[PDB]
Every structure is written in C-alpha cells, then in structure tokens.
Write a protein that binds this ligand. Structure first.
Ligand SMILES: O=C(O)c1cc(S)ccc1[N+](=O)[O-]
Ligand SMILES: O=C(O)c1cc(S)ccc1[N+](=O)[O-]
Length: 84
C-alpha cells in the first residue's frame, strides 16, 4: 500500500543502514537492475539512497515490494529487524 518514497526520512535511514556493505547490490539485482546499472550508483555519495530514490520513482515501489525483495534474497532478518 505505502510507497517507499513516502516513508519519513527517519525510517528510510534505518532501511539504508541495514542495506550497507554489499546488501544494496544484492537487493538491486532482485529489483531487476543489471550489474553495470548497479555499478553506476557507486558514483554517488550514498549508493543505497540513490538506488532507492531511482527505484522509488515507479508507482509499484511500495514498502511491501521492498520487503518482498528482501525475503527473496534470503534477508528476512532485515525484514524482521525493520518490523520490530
Ligand atoms: O550509514 C550509511 O551507510 C549511510 C551512508 C550514506 S552516504 C547515507 C545514509 C546512510 N544511512 O542512513 O545508513
Ligand atoms: O511502517 C513501518 O514502520 C514499517 C513496518 C515494517 S513491517 C517494515 C518496515 C517499516 N518501515 O521501514 O517503515
């Protein structure tokens, strides 16, 4: 129901924190981004934030779609942690 982009900055920075390291790359793969497209975000100061801002532009970029993507890369631990 809720668009990712509509979440308060405070929630989005929790999401971003948990997607640190290479997790954002794994997630981006699941969201349908090609390797070189992903590599293009490494030029940003905040690659995770840049990715999700781009992804979040679509109308099907809901929190639940994001959460679904995370379960699929076997990172339900992040879903559990955010739902806590
Ligand atoms: O700690 C990070 O990995 C992080 C980095 C940048 S550039 C922006 C937001 C962040 N948050 O919020 O996690
Ligand atoms: O709306 C919420 O508080 C929220 C709930 C769940 S289950 C997961 C992530 C969330 N984030 O990130 O906002």
């Amino acid at each position: 129901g809720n668009l990712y982009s509509s979440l308060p900055l405070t929630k989005r920075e929790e999401v971003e924190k948990l997607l640190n390291g290479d997790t954002w790359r794994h997630l981006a793969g699941e969201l349908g981004y090609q390797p070189e497209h992903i590599d293009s975000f490494t030029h940003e100061a905040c690659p995770v934030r840049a990715l999700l801002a781009s992804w979040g532009a679509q109308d099907s970029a809901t929190l639940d779609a994001l959460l679904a993507a995370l379960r699929r890369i076997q990172r339900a631990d992040i879903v559990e942690s955010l739902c806590s």
